[PDB]
Amino acid sequence: HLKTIVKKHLSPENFDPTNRKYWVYDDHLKNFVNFKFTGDVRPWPLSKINHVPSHIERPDYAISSIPESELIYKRKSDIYVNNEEEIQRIREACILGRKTLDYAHTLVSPGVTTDEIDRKVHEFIIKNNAYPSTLNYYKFPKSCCTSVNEIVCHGIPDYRPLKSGDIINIDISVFYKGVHSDLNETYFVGDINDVPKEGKELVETCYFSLMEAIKKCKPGMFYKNIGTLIDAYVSKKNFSVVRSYSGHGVGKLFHSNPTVPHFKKNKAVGIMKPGHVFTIEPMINQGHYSDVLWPDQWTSATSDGKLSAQFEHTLLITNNGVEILTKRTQDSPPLGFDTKDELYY
Ligand SMILES: [Fe+3]
């Protein structure tokens, strides 16, 4: 009974995203039966969880789903100061995160499913003796997040094929030598001319909002000032800043202090000091700032169904400035606009 329905109605080649009849038989789609979507993106069925070989070191949530070292009590003012040996380890995880993102980028093309991309990303991380940080983190079922068009963040890779003209953020994190790396980029799928013009401007504005904020980071600067910089930059182009998600400390813990909002007049706690490692990851919207959480408990979409774009780096505060651990390299595929690396390195 169950097997036939999956085969006939919930497979990559025959799933109908505009018919909810068989959704009740799929553990992902059943949450959506009464849901009113904000845009054109629909969820598709997921594939079965991908295996992790036994020799790979796992983070503390891999089995139980509960990130216990993150739940250990800390003051909101407690921000971890990495030593040289820890920094080197993070640098190396970030190098691998970059390699993994650059590899995922090469897979993006019309017709390719996000699930295909996730599986190949998973395989690449495993091949490199690392663990995909997202896998089973609060039961997140995949090894990266893929957020197309109006999807703000945490999109779950599924059987939906990419269309020429879509924009897709691919969000990568890897756990390697005891530490995490976190980065992400938004890509144009297929013919750049199929992307809505506002979408090209959106993705590019978001990118520079991020790089311009990073350029100001140094010891003594308030973490709350990041949001001041980002919000001002994107407001000039009449785009808005998502409020529901923030940058975070990263390193020994997947997510730690400080919390880093990307909007102005925020109450972020902390000043930047040498040895601090954290992310800035602004999600910027074409229209209204507001997002709705999907009934899968993970996928966020813009409330108006307009486009959203994100970029993310993992950063290290140095004695006199910042270093961008997840920097692009000569092996990084193009973003479709001049990234003006000369301004930042
Ligand atoms: Fe992050």
XYZ file of C-alpha atoms and ligand atoms in Angstrom:
346
model
C 0.000 0.000 0.000
C 2.613 2.504 1.210
C 5.300 1.325 -1.255
C 3.066 1.685 -4.366
C 1.945 5.226 -3.556
C 5.563 6.373 -3.054
C 6.538 4.708 -6.363
C 3.581 6.108 -8.383
C 3.113 9.527 -6.757
C 6.082 10.638 -4.591
C 9.050 9.897 -6.872
C 11.341 12.499 -8.520
C 9.900 11.810 -11.963
C 6.178 11.787 -11.126
C 5.569 13.996 -8.071
C 2.906 16.692 -8.648
C 3.590 19.850 -6.589
C 0.117 21.269 -7.332
C -1.826 18.277 -5.934
C -1.958 17.622 -2.183
C -3.794 14.318 -2.371
C -0.839 12.067 -1.629
C 1.027 14.446 0.745
C -0.480 12.709 3.794
C 1.656 9.616 2.982
C 4.970 11.462 3.019
C 6.581 12.355 6.350
C 7.804 15.743 4.989
C 4.792 16.762 2.888
C 2.116 15.758 5.386
C 2.827 18.911 7.461
C 1.779 21.092 4.463
C -1.723 19.728 3.835
C -3.467 22.893 5.129
C -0.611 25.388 4.539
C -1.016 28.545 2.449
C 2.285 29.168 0.600
C 3.563 32.735 0.112
C 5.137 32.210 -3.307
C 5.652 29.692 -6.152
C 8.219 27.422 -4.492
C 6.669 24.191 -3.182
C 8.231 21.411 -1.071
C 8.927 18.087 -2.826
C 9.571 14.699 -1.213
C 12.955 14.057 0.376
C 15.339 11.136 -0.112
C 16.419 8.772 2.661
C 19.091 9.980 5.113
C 22.615 9.657 3.707
C 25.116 7.407 5.493
C 28.192 8.635 7.387
C 31.137 6.128 7.517
C 32.122 5.096 11.038
C 35.712 6.428 11.033
C 34.543 10.061 10.753
C 34.571 12.107 13.978
C 31.042 13.248 14.788
C 29.787 16.256 16.746
C 27.898 15.678 19.997
C 24.442 15.840 18.359
C 25.042 13.316 15.577
C 23.240 10.440 17.389
C 20.797 12.224 19.792
C 20.097 15.400 17.683
C 20.746 17.560 20.746
C 23.798 19.842 20.705
C 24.768 19.483 24.345
C 27.931 21.618 24.373
C 25.771 24.466 22.977
C 23.299 24.048 25.881
C 26.051 24.219 28.516
C 25.366 27.386 30.512
C 27.203 30.552 29.467
C 26.712 34.272 30.259
C 25.426 36.321 27.325
C 28.696 38.290 27.681
C 30.822 35.042 27.459
C 32.474 35.006 24.002
C 35.061 32.319 23.355
C 38.667 33.400 22.737
C 40.407 30.873 20.478
C 44.102 30.194 20.886
C 46.587 29.749 17.972
C 46.154 25.966 17.808
C 42.343 26.304 17.805
C 42.487 29.076 15.201
C 44.611 26.903 12.856
C 42.053 24.094 13.207
C 39.229 26.537 12.305
C 41.185 27.961 9.387
C 41.540 24.377 8.064
C 37.823 23.590 8.470
C 37.081 26.867 6.658
C 39.410 25.876 3.814
C 37.448 22.635 3.492
C 34.128 24.553 3.748
C 35.248 26.735 0.861
C 36.267 23.676 -1.234
C 32.855 22.132 -0.532
C 30.850 25.260 -1.413
C 32.904 25.775 -4.613
C 32.255 22.154 -5.579
C 28.460 22.531 -4.887
C 28.443 25.691 -6.990
C 29.667 23.632 -10.003
C 26.567 21.366 -9.682
C 24.009 24.129 -10.092
C 22.216 23.932 -13.453
C 18.656 23.827 -14.763
C 16.891 20.510 -14.188
C 19.166 19.442 -11.314
C 17.332 18.742 -7.986
C 18.530 20.200 -4.686
C 18.515 16.651 -3.328
C 21.035 15.672 -6.072
C 23.168 18.609 -4.972
C 22.859 17.708 -1.244
C 23.829 14.084 -1.857
C 26.923 15.004 -3.872
C 27.864 17.642 -1.256
C 27.447 14.997 1.466
C 29.724 12.616 -0.459
C 32.405 15.318 -0.911
C 32.418 16.124 2.850
C 32.632 12.436 3.726
C 35.430 11.898 1.152
C 37.388 14.602 3.026
C 36.938 12.852 6.404
C 34.527 15.447 7.729
C 30.963 15.521 9.056
C 28.200 17.767 7.597
C 27.309 19.984 10.547
C 23.657 20.337 9.627
C 22.977 16.543 9.579
C 20.651 15.667 12.526
C 21.192 19.050 14.156
C 17.822 19.263 15.900
C 16.905 16.424 13.475
C 17.647 18.465 10.327
C 17.620 15.615 7.804
C 20.134 16.776 5.127
C 23.863 17.876 4.889
C 23.463 21.444 3.541
C 20.558 23.930 3.092
C 19.260 24.980 -0.302
C 17.090 28.085 -0.443
C 15.536 28.985 -3.816
C 13.856 32.328 -4.734
C 11.540 33.434 -1.878
C 13.077 30.892 0.507
C 14.935 32.994 3.083
C 16.976 30.202 4.671
C 17.179 26.582 5.828
C 15.467 25.159 2.702
C 15.548 21.324 2.854
C 17.110 19.741 -0.314
C 14.339 17.813 -2.079
C 13.187 16.482 -5.461
C 12.354 19.969 -6.885
C 14.348 20.524 -10.090
C 16.004 23.927 -10.480
C 14.648 26.240 -13.180
C 16.710 28.610 -15.331
C 16.234 32.064 -13.781
C 16.027 30.846 -10.156
C 18.397 32.017 -7.480
C 19.625 29.472 -4.983
C 21.561 29.913 -1.822
C 23.601 26.899 -0.897
C 24.576 26.868 2.769
C 27.482 24.701 3.747
C 28.938 23.737 7.129
C 31.518 21.111 7.858
C 32.843 19.668 11.176
C 36.513 18.794 10.932
C 39.302 18.382 13.470
C 36.880 19.211 16.318
C 35.534 22.546 14.910
C 32.863 23.919 12.508
C 32.994 26.166 9.473
C 29.976 28.033 8.072
C 29.641 29.769 4.715
C 27.116 30.316 1.997
C 26.529 32.013 -1.341
C 23.569 32.746 -3.616
C 23.796 31.635 -7.276
C 21.910 32.396 -10.518
C 20.615 29.173 -12.125
C 21.201 28.773 -15.865
C 20.826 31.752 -18.185
C 21.519 34.870 -16.118
C 19.035 36.675 -18.436
C 16.250 34.477 -17.037
C 16.824 35.937 -13.564
C 14.483 38.863 -12.745
C 16.494 42.097 -12.905
C 15.597 42.981 -9.301
C 17.019 39.562 -8.356
C 20.392 40.312 -9.882
C 20.573 43.607 -7.962
C 19.370 41.887 -4.771
C 22.043 39.159 -4.787
C 24.808 41.671 -5.605
C 23.643 44.221 -3.025
C 23.606 41.501 -0.354
C 27.128 40.379 -1.263
C 28.596 43.902 -0.851
C 26.523 44.573 2.269
C 28.402 41.619 3.714
C 31.862 42.540 2.426
C 31.499 46.220 3.411
C 30.525 45.220 6.998
C 33.417 42.774 7.282
C 35.905 45.494 6.208
C 35.023 47.522 9.338
C 35.433 44.636 11.853
C 38.320 45.081 14.299
C 39.014 44.879 18.032
C 36.925 47.391 20.082
C 33.988 47.424 17.563
C 30.519 46.553 18.894
C 28.862 43.447 17.401
C 25.636 45.525 17.267
C 27.319 47.902 14.759
C 27.329 45.131 12.084
C 23.576 45.472 11.722
C 23.937 49.258 11.528
C 26.293 48.923 8.531
C 24.332 46.213 6.707
C 20.910 47.805 7.130
C 22.163 51.195 5.843
C 23.838 49.607 2.805
C 20.816 47.625 1.568
C 18.259 50.351 2.468
C 19.889 52.553 -0.226
C 18.729 50.011 -2.803
C 15.247 49.682 -1.226
C 15.780 46.125 0.017
C 14.926 44.910 3.531
C 16.721 42.934 6.269
C 15.372 39.652 7.635
C 15.068 39.885 11.452
C 14.380 36.205 12.365
C 17.962 34.908 11.970
C 21.385 36.167 13.010
C 25.082 35.493 12.729
C 26.659 33.579 15.623
C 29.941 32.526 17.186
C 31.254 29.398 15.472
C 34.207 27.128 16.202
C 34.216 24.393 18.823
C 30.430 24.958 18.930
C 28.297 25.086 15.760
C 26.447 28.101 17.214
C 27.750 30.151 20.163
C 27.983 33.764 21.349
C 27.673 36.463 20.267
C 24.364 36.707 18.456
C 24.812 39.048 15.435
C 21.665 40.645 13.979
C 21.928 42.238 10.497
C 19.369 45.019 11.111
C 19.850 48.468 12.685
C 19.170 49.455 16.302
C 19.698 45.913 17.625
C 20.681 44.912 21.152
C 23.574 42.548 20.255
C 25.892 42.046 23.240
C 29.696 42.178 23.024
C 32.784 43.883 21.614
C 35.141 42.297 19.083
C 38.429 40.947 20.538
C 41.358 39.025 19.012
C 40.581 35.261 18.848
C 36.806 35.696 18.344
C 35.385 33.549 15.476
C 31.842 34.250 14.283
C 29.663 34.608 11.207
C 27.916 37.479 9.423
C 25.190 36.167 7.193
C 22.719 38.829 6.131
C 19.498 37.581 4.514
C 18.065 40.455 2.460
C 14.623 40.609 0.860
C 13.307 42.129 -2.401
C 10.122 43.353 -0.654
C 8.966 43.202 2.968
C 11.303 42.164 5.780
C 8.891 39.586 7.272
C 9.253 35.830 6.917
C 6.989 32.855 7.664
C 8.243 29.529 9.035
C 7.056 26.448 6.999
C 5.360 23.590 8.840
C 8.568 21.437 8.418
C 9.848 23.673 11.281
C 12.883 24.720 9.191
C 12.135 26.306 5.830
C 11.602 30.087 6.107
C 9.894 32.012 3.236
C 9.254 35.710 2.610
C 5.747 36.613 3.685
C 5.150 38.468 0.319
C 6.702 35.732 -1.854
C 9.402 38.003 -3.261
C 13.058 37.038 -3.640
C 15.516 36.746 -0.806
C 19.288 36.458 -0.978
C 22.035 35.535 1.508
C 25.825 35.444 1.822
C 27.867 34.220 4.776
C 31.475 34.153 5.944
C 33.262 32.796 9.009
C 35.517 35.504 10.453
C 38.483 35.771 12.752
C 39.231 39.033 14.645
C 43.044 39.545 14.532
C 45.324 41.825 16.559
C 44.437 44.776 14.287
C 41.480 43.842 12.062
C 39.738 40.783 10.658
C 40.612 37.761 8.504
C 37.999 36.078 6.314
C 38.513 32.368 6.851
C 35.984 31.285 4.251
C 37.374 33.579 1.525
C 36.863 32.815 -2.124
C 39.970 31.494 -3.977
C 41.198 31.117 -7.573
C 39.206 27.818 -7.713
C 35.910 29.584 -6.866
C 33.384 29.610 -9.740
C 31.940 33.056 -10.733
C 29.063 34.847 -8.963
C 27.778 36.647 -12.121
C 29.043 40.103 -11.108
C 32.413 41.655 -10.362
C 33.127 40.874 -6.669
C 35.849 43.604 -6.515
C 38.204 41.477 -4.473
C 40.742 44.319 -4.651
C 38.610 46.287 -2.167
C 38.844 43.520 0.515
C 42.195 41.690 0.311
Fe 25.223 30.377 10.102
